[PDB]
Ligand binder design. Structure first.
Ligand SMILES: [Br-]
Ligand SMILES: [Br-]
Ligand SMILES: [Br-]
Length: 310
């Protein structure tokens, strides 16, 4: 149905520090012919599930330093790849990717796997999309670990979640330029620039899902959605603000990548205030937009905080 392609499996043969076995979900309600990849580590019968949602232009490989930590604590870890990323199938037409297309996939994934006692772990698009999930089925969500992200509401409702789109010139403006303009986009080069701490091998892992341009429709469409937010995205995100403010009563942990020119303190503090009960954020000085690359520390501290509140 949705015209899509699949990344040859050989592309993933030499990943660095990615020993997690593949699991797949074929023909999800509303996603016929599409195969979604996800990780399922730790005790399958654990009473706690850490739902790790990735962003642009990464995949579950991003959480590779956090997964082991949550699993060692006795919890189950679910890290899916959005359609267009990682090992999931990738629609060829940008016009197929929308806010609700990625959101409904997440909701369908949760129902199918009947996830409960969820500790929502988000960053970037993982959060733009993830933070809107709980209000649809609140009984399923227990905790939240928020890293550099926010809600795609309109400029009037929350100016802090729109201002970063235009300024600074070297922030989202630069980011989106690097993504949507190159005819021959090299994500390993992109990530080495936006995550200066990565090694050559680690950057290669981010290029792995895309042999060429035809596999990058999902990558190109993401920043265009941050710039142009449809009505559903605005309504859904606006309704999500009211949820975190008036309905949320779970444990929360926040971590900020201080060097992030896109979703740092400017967006994160307004966010912290919107989330009822959100404590004092952990500020990681050396971290940029991809906080998960400094994720072992985030993961460990989040567990300590969660335990001290048990
Ligand atoms: Br970095
Ligand atoms: Br690439
Ligand atoms: Br983006």
């Amino acid at each position: 149905m949705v015209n899509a392609i699949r990344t040859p499996d050989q592309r993933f043969s030499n990943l660095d520090q990615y020993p997690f076995s593949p699991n797949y979900l074929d023909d999800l309600p509303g996603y016929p012919g599409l195969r979604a990849h996800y990780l399922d580590e730790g005790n399958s019968d654990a009473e706690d599930v850490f739902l790790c949602l990735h962003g642009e232009p990464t995949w579950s490989y991003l959480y590779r330093k956090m997964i082991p930590v949550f699993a060692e604590s006795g919890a189950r870890v679910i890290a899916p790849d959005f359609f267009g990323f990682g090992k999931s199938d990738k629609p060829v037409d940008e016009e197929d990717y929308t806010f609700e297309f990625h959101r409904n996939f997440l909701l369908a994934l949760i129902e199918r796997l009947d996830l409960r006692n969820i500790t929502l772990v988000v960053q970037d698009w993982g959060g733009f999309l993830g933070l809107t999930l709980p209000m649809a089925d609140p009984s399923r969500f227990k905790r939240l670990i928020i890293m550099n992200a926010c809600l795609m509401t309109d400029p009037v409702t929350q100016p802090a979640f729109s201002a970063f789109v235009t300024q600074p010139a070297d922030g989202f403006t630069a980011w989106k330029y690097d993504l949507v303009t190159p005819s021959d986009l090299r994500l390993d080069q992109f990530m080495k620039r936006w995550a200066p701490t990565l090694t050559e091998a680690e950057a290669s892992a981010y290029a792995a899902p895309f042999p060429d341009t035809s596999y990058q429709a999902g990558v190109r469409k993401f920043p265009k959605m941050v710039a142009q937010r449809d009505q559903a995205c605005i309504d859904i995100s606006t309704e999500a603000i009211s949820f975190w403010q008036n309905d949320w009563n779970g444990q929360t942990f926040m971590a900020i990548g201080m060097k992030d020119k896109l979703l740092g303190p400017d967006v994160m503090y307004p966010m912290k205030a919107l989330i009822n009960g959100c404590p004092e954020p952990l500020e990681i000085a050396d971290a940029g937009h991809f906080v998960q690359e400094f994720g072992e520390q985030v993961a460990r501290e989040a567990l300590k905080h969660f335990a001290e509140t048990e």
